[PDB]
Write a protein that holds these residues in place. Structure first.
Motif, mmCIF file in Angstrom:
data_model
loop_
_atom_site.group_PDB
_atom_site.id
_atom_site.type_symbol
_atom_site.label_atom_id
_atom_site.label_comp_id
_atom_site.label_asym_id
_atom_site.label_seq_id
_atom_site.Cartn_x
_atom_site.Cartn_y
_atom_site.Cartn_z
ATOM 1 N N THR A 271 0.737 -1.357 0.000
ATOM 2 C CA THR A 271 0.000 0.000 0.000
ATOM 3 C C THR A 271 0.743 1.369 0.000
ATOM 4 N N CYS A 272 0.091 2.402 -0.514
ATOM 5 C CA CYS A 272 0.714 3.752 -0.710
ATOM 6 C C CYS A 272 1.284 4.267 0.589
ATOM 7 N N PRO A 273 2.592 4.516 0.668
ATOM 8 C CA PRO A 273 3.145 4.985 1.959
ATOM 9 C C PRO A 273 2.732 6.405 2.339
ATOM 10 N N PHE A 274 2.756 6.688 3.642
ATOM 11 C CA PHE A 274 2.327 7.969 4.157
ATOM 12 C C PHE A 274 3.134 9.130 3.584
ATOM 13 N N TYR A 275 4.425 8.944 3.331
ATOM 14 C CA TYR A 275 5.236 9.980 2.672
ATOM 15 C C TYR A 275 4.898 10.368 1.218
ATOM 16 N N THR B 234 -6.193 16.349 2.042
ATOM 17 C CA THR B 234 -6.582 16.427 0.644
ATOM 18 C C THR B 234 -6.751 14.957 0.235
ATOM 19 N N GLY B 235 -7.239 14.721 -0.970
ATOM 20 C CA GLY B 235 -7.113 13.420 -1.612
ATOM 21 C C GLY B 235 -6.009 13.423 -2.669
ATOM 22 N N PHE B 236 -4.885 14.125 -2.408
ATOM 23 C CA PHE B 236 -3.783 14.125 -3.336
ATOM 24 C C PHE B 236 -2.710 13.107 -2.957
ATOM 25 N N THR B 237 -2.053 12.566 -3.993
ATOM 26 C CA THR B 237 -0.811 11.855 -3.848
ATOM 27 C C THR B 237 0.283 12.432 -4.825
ATOM 28 N N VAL B 238 1.524 12.068 -4.535
ATOM 29 C CA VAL B 238 2.717 12.492 -5.302
ATOM 30 C C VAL B 238 3.619 11.315 -5.591
ATOM 31 N N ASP B 239 3.946 11.136 -6.860
ATOM 32 C CA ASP B 239 4.782 10.050 -7.351
ATOM 33 C C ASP B 239 4.337 8.657 -6.884
ATOM 34 N N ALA B 240 3.039 8.422 -6.944
ATOM 35 C CA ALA B 240 2.457 7.197 -6.320
ATOM 36 C C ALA B 240 1.632 6.402 -7.342
ATOM 37 N N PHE B 241 2.303 5.846 -8.349
ATOM 38 C CA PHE B 241 1.609 5.160 -9.463
ATOM 39 C C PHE B 241 1.731 3.635 -9.477
ATOM 40 N N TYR C 174 0.889 1.455 -7.053
ATOM 41 C CA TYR C 174 0.128 0.716 -6.004
ATOM 42 C C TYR C 174 -1.286 0.436 -6.449
ATOM 43 N N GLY C 175 -1.548 0.541 -7.750
ATOM 44 C CA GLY C 175 -2.921 0.434 -8.296
ATOM 45 C C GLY C 175 -3.760 1.608 -7.860
ATOM 46 N N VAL C 176 -5.065 1.421 -7.712
ATOM 47 C CA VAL C 176 -5.941 2.508 -7.265
ATOM 48 C C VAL C 176 -5.668 2.826 -5.795
ATOM 49 N N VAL C 177 -5.284 4.073 -5.504
ATOM 50 C CA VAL C 177 -5.094 4.508 -4.094
ATOM 51 C C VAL C 177 -6.425 4.989 -3.546
ATOM 52 N N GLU C 178 -6.870 4.413 -2.421
ATOM 53 C CA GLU C 178 -8.229 4.665 -1.877
ATOM 54 C C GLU C 178 -8.268 6.079 -1.358
ATOM 55 N N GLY C 179 -9.279 6.831 -1.823
ATOM 56 C CA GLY C 179 -9.424 8.234 -1.521
ATOM 57 C C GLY C 179 -8.775 9.231 -2.486
ATOM 58 N N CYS C 180 -7.878 8.772 -3.360
ATOM 59 C CA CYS C 180 -7.091 9.698 -4.186
ATOM 60 C C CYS C 180 -7.893 10.241 -5.380
ATOM 61 N N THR C 181 -8.076 11.547 -5.424
ATOM 62 C CA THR C 181 -8.775 12.212 -6.508
ATOM 63 C C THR C 181 -7.825 12.858 -7.565
ATOM 64 N N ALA C 182 -6.557 13.080 -7.206
ATOM 65 C CA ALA C 182 -5.579 13.685 -8.128
ATOM 66 C C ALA C 182 -4.177 13.132 -7.819
ATOM 67 N N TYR C 183 -3.475 12.651 -8.860
ATOM 68 C CA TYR C 183 -2.157 12.050 -8.754
ATOM 69 C C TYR C 183 -1.162 13.060 -9.365
ATOM 70 N N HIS D 226 9.801 7.369 -10.330
ATOM 71 C CA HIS D 226 8.729 8.232 -9.884
ATOM 72 C C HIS D 226 7.462 7.981 -10.676
ATOM 73 N N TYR D 227 7.624 7.672 -11.976
ATOM 74 C CA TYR D 227 6.442 7.397 -12.789
ATOM 75 C C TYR D 227 5.990 5.910 -12.768
ATOM 76 N N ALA D 228 6.815 5.032 -12.182
ATOM 77 C CA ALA D 228 6.642 3.550 -12.172
ATOM 78 C C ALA D 228 5.194 3.146 -11.982
ATOM 79 N N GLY D 229 4.655 2.351 -12.911
ATOM 80 C CA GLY D 229 3.240 1.961 -12.955
ATOM 81 C C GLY D 229 2.318 2.738 -13.895
#
Ligand code: NI
Length: 341
Positions: free
Chosen positions: A1-5, A11-18, A20-29, A38-41
């Protein structure tokens, strides 16, 4: 799963988090830059919104074949709204199109994510200086006092003078520069400019360069290897065997090679200055190792953080072992005690 860092609180944002499949809650990557870790996935199969610089969007479109509907490029140095939240992209001084992101949270907290960066004093007079930053997500690649290196400009000057001397002594010498991703383009562009040449390269590499919004690019690069006296090859070919092999391929148009391997740090940073550097040589082929860095040295990183005075630091690199995290926390406390925040 997507690490806290890789998550931005409240927000429902993540950064460089591709990866881990669908990240629960994430509206913008968000994607800071176009390097494979960084782009992996990410691929043509991704169907959620990606926010990034214009250069990073060109690459996603053309190299990865991500569908246009999902690419949201944003301009630099401009306050923008993403899903109800104010953001700013800043130049990271890393590779082409690489950004730091400033997030202004609804509660009034301010967060800087550096991405990958090479800290510089010009960052002390950007939009960052206008307000307090509470949390910093930090590129800790070189977070240890042994990691010193020259300025980019020192290394380029050395490369220029070296190449010019060699080709004036032997006008049938070829210059080769090794490469494995985007970044460090100034090395080969500066060598070519002093020799009055275009840079020759493969079709895949030329296509990559054509995405990077470099002014007058069509006058600087070509796919016609024949017509150019600076060539780009994969880093893996920068050795005596690979270089003799390439020299056989060029059709006796050249009888010598001078090659540069731009690297990060390697252990010989601890004694040598750039002016003392001498190549490895076997016959008519010479290879120079040049430490052209697009990451912060220890001193550059320390300066930036001591200026910024964050209330909390979240490391983004070398976080996989407790020993590394412990070592990093020690340096962060020293910096805080010295500077009084
Ligand atoms: Ni990078």
């Amino acid at each position: 799963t997507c690490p806290f860092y890789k998550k931005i609180p409240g927000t429902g944002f993540t950064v460089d988090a591709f990866q881990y499949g669908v990240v629960e809650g994430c509206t913008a990557y968000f994607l800071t830059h176009f390097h494979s870790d960084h782009y992996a996935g990410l691929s043509k199969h991704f169907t959620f919104p990606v926010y990034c610089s214009e250069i990073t969007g060109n690459l996603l479109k053309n190299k990865l074949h991500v569908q246009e509907q999902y690419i949201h490029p944003l301009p630099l140095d401009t306050e923008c709204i993403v899903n109800g939240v104010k953001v700013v992209l800043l130049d990271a001084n890393h590779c082409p199109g690489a950004v730091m992101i400033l997030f202004y949270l609804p509660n009034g907290t301010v967060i800087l994510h550096t991405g990958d960066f090479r800290a510089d004093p010009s960052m002390e007079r950007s939009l960052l200086a206008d307000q307090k930053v509470h949390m910093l997500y930090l590129d800790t690649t070189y977070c240890s006092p042994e990691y010193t290196f020259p300025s980019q400009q020192e290394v380029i000057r050395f490369a220029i003078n070296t190449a010019f001397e060699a080709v004036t002594l032997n006008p049938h010498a070829l210059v080769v520069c090794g490469t494995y991703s985007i970044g460090k383009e100034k090395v080969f562009l500066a060598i070519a400019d002093v020799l009055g040449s275009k840079v020759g390269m493969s079709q895949e590499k030329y296509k990559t360069l054509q995405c990077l919004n470099i002014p007058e690019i069509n006058s600087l690069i070509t796919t016609d290897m024949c017509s150019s006296l600076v060539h780009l090859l994969p880093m893996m070919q920068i050795n005596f065997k690979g270089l003799q092999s390439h020299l056989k391929k060029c059709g006796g148009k050249y009888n010598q090679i001078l090659a540069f391997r731009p690297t990060g740090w390697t252990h010989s940073n601890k004694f040598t200055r750039i002016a003392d550097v001498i190549p490895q040589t076997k016959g008519n082929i010479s290879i120079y190792g040049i430490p052209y860095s697009e990451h912060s040295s220890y001193l550059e990183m320390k300066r930036f953080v001591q200026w910024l005075k964050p209330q909390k630091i979240i490391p983004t690199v070398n976080v996989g072992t407790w020993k590394s995290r412990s070592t990093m926390e020690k340096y962060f406390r020293e910096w805080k005690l010295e500077a009084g925040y």
